[PDB]
Design a protein around this nucleic acid. Structure first.
Lengths: 98, 206, 96, 127, 114, 150, 79
RNA sequence: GGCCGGGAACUCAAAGGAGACUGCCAGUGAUAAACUGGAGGAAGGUGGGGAUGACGUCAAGUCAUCAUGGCCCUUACGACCAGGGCUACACACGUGCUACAAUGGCGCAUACAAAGAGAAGCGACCUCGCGAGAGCAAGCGGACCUCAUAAAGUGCGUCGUAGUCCGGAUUGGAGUCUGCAACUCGACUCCAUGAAGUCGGAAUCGCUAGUAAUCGUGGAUCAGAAUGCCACGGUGAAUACGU
């Protein structure tokens, strides 16, 4: 079984990422079961402001980076034949992963 | 200090970016360092460009960094040299076969950095701090920016007095989240200490 | 300031490759219990100002060692201006 | 038939299935006295079950993972109430009168930094 | 009567009571009684002579109550009551482990001495 | 002050189905220990029946009438001057202080375990002793005798 | 005492354990390495420990086997 | 084992929403506002939390983060390297943790989470170490591999408060790994160590529901060396009439 990753950041990018691929990575051959979530992963920051006796601040900074699961389990040529005809959504990969 | 920067706290709205791209852990850090090398050596060398912003996008191993600039004819260089030579600069200072992009800034009165550049350009012009200060205020008002409170950093006059310039004009609802206030500052290394300026253009809504 | 200090380790890491990355591993098999020949261990002593434990975790803007982060490794002080201005993607003030 | 309710109480998540008859309660493929057998919280879930009739008419083949003693029970004590709503949509008043309809949204403090338990100020008695 | 010295136990769990011995201790009590093959939750009053006979032999191979604290003692002055840093902390009573020697290490040096 | 809060609504006893008994374990909670209190106070209360030898569902109060408080000091510094001014007990404290009068001398009494040490003091009130009893002996002294300043 | 296997000494004297031990002993050694242990085969040999001003001596025996130097050399002038 | 199919019903998960908005019954109340009793619905009067600190405010502090006027010296109040010291003590204080136990301890059986981290990593597993960890090692680019099992807890005998199997200082011995090398100034393990302290006065401070109280869990910082700090869960009350 092949499981796909969709490395994006925000709704403004992940929204079309999980749908532009399901429409193109499943034309006839692939068994894409629709957009599967793979819930996002989050990391947090502990940031101080001005280096002084004041450890008070400890600002917070979080990163909500999400991934999707188009999951092309079928190595169909036409499903990946149209993979190179689009260039929007700059940083995203079709990771052919088990 | 209780005045958080309004742009980043509103970055969750259409507030733009200047380095948005993707990486794994094995190459966040170096790519971030590559981003600063292009971030710094494109500002000191580009004082006269009146740059609004330089934005880094990294699609795949060949990046599409765009530059927000005031005068379209001046940023071309000697007709494409800076397009190529700075791409030569970035081709190794970032380590990727990058592609440079240049973005215009229509009505540079509408950019908080560029106006703060304009005042700072004339702060060192050896002028007095009040008349020149208010003169620019209405210029934007004649061209929009429906609200700006204008601030100038400390060290005014020959004396120990280092004060602030509050000088509100219009509507700058900082605590209101739906404010999309245009903010950037500017500073000037004066013959006596540090003199800076802070300006908050209000660009309507949404 | 202390750029010489901030450049001190810059030359106390430039030798690490030729000494540790290509020789220490050859002596490292002796170092861990894989046979502890005391005499053979002398070879690693040839470099001193380089060491895996001699990382100074030097912030690459102002050279303070304190304030590192293994993902990138920058002080907490300069990321602040990098935050609102967008230089670090995928970050906004952590409102949870 | 099988009767479905999600249920969630204090970050606890189960899946509660009621079937007519077959009184035995299967919880993580464990008996009543095996998994929730005689603990600090082993009748705190079935107070909504004496107001309604007894064991013999309802089955609980329960998909429950996650939670504490009262947490794995919390996903149940609330999980049962949502999964018996479609069992009978008219008895809603009694449990709302008893309060068991209302979800226990008493979520524990998401801690804030500074104060020790995020709302409790440390010991610096002299000021 | 007494097997080998100090800390004679009475009416306490065999391992729990054998911890009173200073030869054996917190876990040598159970380790040595593992070699004794006796019950553990039983009181020392429950012990008889037929099992404590297997203790004098195993306390000979082990450190005895009376000695244990003496050979550790002059072994310090045997090697490490010279200008040794730790011995500087023994003849004076200060900690050798390198923690903050002023306060919060009160038991090592003794009572508070204002 | 000017605003008020209603009493928090409490489910009944998970074992006897009586809300008053359920509130009782809630006050003894130090270190967050009801599950230990299950082997401490619930093990205590289970033994309170046969040691008492009667149904501890409504006979449970046959040792509490003397404990009924009437007054406590309320610090009214009225106008900036602290006074005695003992206000009569309102229901939100006269019963809370009844539970506050229980385990003041039942932690380290030097016995088997407070799993059953508390199971010693309860029948004592209907056996005419225990911690809850002498609590009312001192309250009578502070009031009803200082009329010139009470 | 922090190795228990593969005991190593710095070349503040290891450079000379092959060069000064062969000469018997000399004036107390110009040794800034109080960190290593002394092996039992340096009986009586004078290793002058740099307390920080200069190099201070220590008296050496053979019941000495796996013990450290800097231990035998106080660093701070108490009082 | 839900293992493969397979449903994605559906826990969980996510791209968008709706739902509480004084919305309504009724009332206090000038009718008003406001307030209250009641109802609805998961959610009644900012549902619950954080983000967001006005004018100002203090020669506040920061030229030791940086930038920064002026003051300096530039074979130097520049620097390289090697020892030590930031932890040294004669004491006082600030903070935290650990206890002072049987609401605990022992071991036995037992079910008990969440968030995270990471192909220069955790390291599965496999052997021993009483352990430290070591020899072997999958897997993964992480809804795929580990940390990581929860923990207090309950039933089992247990001592019935023993300066205590409490507690852990402590010391030296034995060792494990980290790093060349770790006395000062590594950690960790085993052993002996069983001290003061058996709930702390003058007093004083914190505390508003999942609150206190706790129980643990990990993370970052980490060659390495948390009672510090970040983050997550487990259990879970009263006080608040009053100006």
């Amino acid at each position: 079984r092949i499981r796909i990753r969709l490395k994006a950041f925000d709704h403004r990018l992940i929204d079309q990422a999980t749908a532009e691929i399901v429409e193109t990575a499943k034309r006839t051959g692939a068994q894409v079961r629709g957009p599967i979530p793979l819930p996002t992963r989050k990391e947090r920051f502990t940031v101080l402001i001005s280096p002084h006796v004041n450890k008070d601040a400890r600002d917070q900074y979080e990163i909500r980076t999400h991934l999707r699961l188009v999951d092309i389990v079928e190595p169909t040529e036409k499903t990946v034949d149209a993979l190179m005809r689009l260039d929007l959504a700059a940083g995203v990969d079709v990771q052919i992963s088990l | 200090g209780q005045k958080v920067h309004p742009n980043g706290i509103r970055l969750g709205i259409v507030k733009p970016w200047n380095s948005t791209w993707f990486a794994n852990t094995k190459e966040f850090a170096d790519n971030l360092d590559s981003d600063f090398k292009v971030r710094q050596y494109l500002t000191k060398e580009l004082a006269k460009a009146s740059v609004s912003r330089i934005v880094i996008e990294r699609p795949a191993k060949s990046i599409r960094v765009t530059i927000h600039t005031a005068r379209p004819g001046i940023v071309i260089g000697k007709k494409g040299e800076d397009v190529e030579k700075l791409r030569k600069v970035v081709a190794d200072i970032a380590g990727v076969p990058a592609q440079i992009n240049i973005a215009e800034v229509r009505k540079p009165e509408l950019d908080a950095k560029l106006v703060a550049d304009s005042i700072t350009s004339q702060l060192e012009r050896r002028v007095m701090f009040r008349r020149a200060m208010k003169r620019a205020v209405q210029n934007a008002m004649r061209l929009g920016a429906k609200g700006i409170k204008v601030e100038v950093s400390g060290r005014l006059g020959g004396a120990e007095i280092a004060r602030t310039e509050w000088y509100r004009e219009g509507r700058v609802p900082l605590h209101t989240l739906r404010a999309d206030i245009d903010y950037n500052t500017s500073e000037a290394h004066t013959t006596y200490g540090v003199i800076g300026v802070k300006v908050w253009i209000f660009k309507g809504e949404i | 300031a202390k750029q010489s200090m901030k450049a001190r380790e810059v030359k106390r890491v430039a030798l690490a490759d030729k000494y540790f990355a290509k020789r220490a591993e050859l002596k490292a098999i002796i170092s861990d219990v894989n046979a502890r020949w005391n005499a053979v261990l002398k070879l690693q002593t040839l470099p001193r100002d380089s060491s895996p434990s001699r990382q100074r975790n030097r912030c690459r803007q102002t050279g303070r060692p304190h304030g590192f982060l293994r993902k990138f490794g920058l002080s907490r002080i300069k990321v602040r201006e990098a935050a609102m201005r967008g230089e670090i993607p995928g970050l906004k003030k952590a409102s949870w | 038939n099988q009767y479905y309710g999600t249920g969630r109480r204090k970050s606890s998540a189960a899946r509660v299935f009621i079937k007519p008859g077959n009184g035995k309660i299967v919880i993580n493929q464990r008996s009543l006295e095996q998994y929730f057998g005689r603990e600090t919280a082993r009748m705190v879930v079935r107070q909504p079950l004496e107001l309604v009739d007894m064991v013999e008419k309802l089955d609980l083949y329960i998909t429950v993972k996650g939670g504490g003693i009262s947490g794995q029970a919390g996903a149940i004590r609330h999980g049962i109430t949502r999964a018996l709503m479609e069992y009978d949509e008219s008895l809603r008043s009694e449990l709302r009168k008893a309060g068991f309809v209302t979800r226990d949204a008493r979520q524990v403090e998401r801690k804030k930094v500074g104060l020790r338990k995020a709302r409790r100020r440390p010991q610096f008695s002299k000021r | 009567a007494r097997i080998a010295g100090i800390n004679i136990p009475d009416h306490k769990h065999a391992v729990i009571a054998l911890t009173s011995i200073y030869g054996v201790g917190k876990t040598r009590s159970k380790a040595i009684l593992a070699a004794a093959g006796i019950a553990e939750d039983v009181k020392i009053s429950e012990l008889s002579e037929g099992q404590i006979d297997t203790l004098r032999d195993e306390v000979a191979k082990f450190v005895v109550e009376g000695d244990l604290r003496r050979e550790i003692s002059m072994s310090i002055k045997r090697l490490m009551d010279l200008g040794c840093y730790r011995g500087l902390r023994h003849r004076r009573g200060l900690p050798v482990r390198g923690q903050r020697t002023k306060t919060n290490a009160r038991t090592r040096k003794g009572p508070r001495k204002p | 002050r000017r605003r008020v809060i209603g009493q928090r609504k409490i489910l009944p006893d998970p074992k006897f189905g009586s809300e008053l008994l359920a509130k009782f374990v809630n006050i003894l909670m130090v270190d967050g220990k009801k599950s230990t209190a299950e082997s401490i106070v619930y093990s205590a209360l289970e033994t309170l029946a046969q040691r008492s030898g009667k149904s501890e569902l409504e006979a449970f109060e046959v040792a509490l009438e003397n404990v009924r408080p009437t007054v406590e000091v309320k610090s009214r510094r009225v106008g900036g001057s602290t006074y005695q001014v003992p206000v009569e007990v309102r229901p939100v404290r006269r019963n809370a202080l009844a539970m506050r009068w229980i385990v003041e001398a039942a932690r380290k009494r030097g016995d088997k375990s407070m799993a059953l040490r508390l199971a010693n003091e309860l029948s004592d009130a209907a056996e005419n002793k225990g911690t809850a009893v002498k609590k009312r002996e001192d309250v009578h002294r502070m009031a009803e005798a200082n009329k010139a300043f009470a | 005492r922090s190795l228990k296997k593969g005991p190593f000494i710095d070349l503040h004297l290891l450079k000379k354990v092959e060069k000064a031990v062969e000469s018997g002993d000399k004036k107390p050694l110009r040794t800034w390495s109080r960190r290593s242990t002394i092996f039992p085969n340096m009986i009586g040999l004078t290793i002058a420990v740099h307390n920080g001003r200069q190099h201070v001596p220590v008296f050496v025996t053979d019941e000495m086997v796996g013990h450290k130097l800097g231990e035998f050399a106080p660093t701070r002038t108490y009082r």
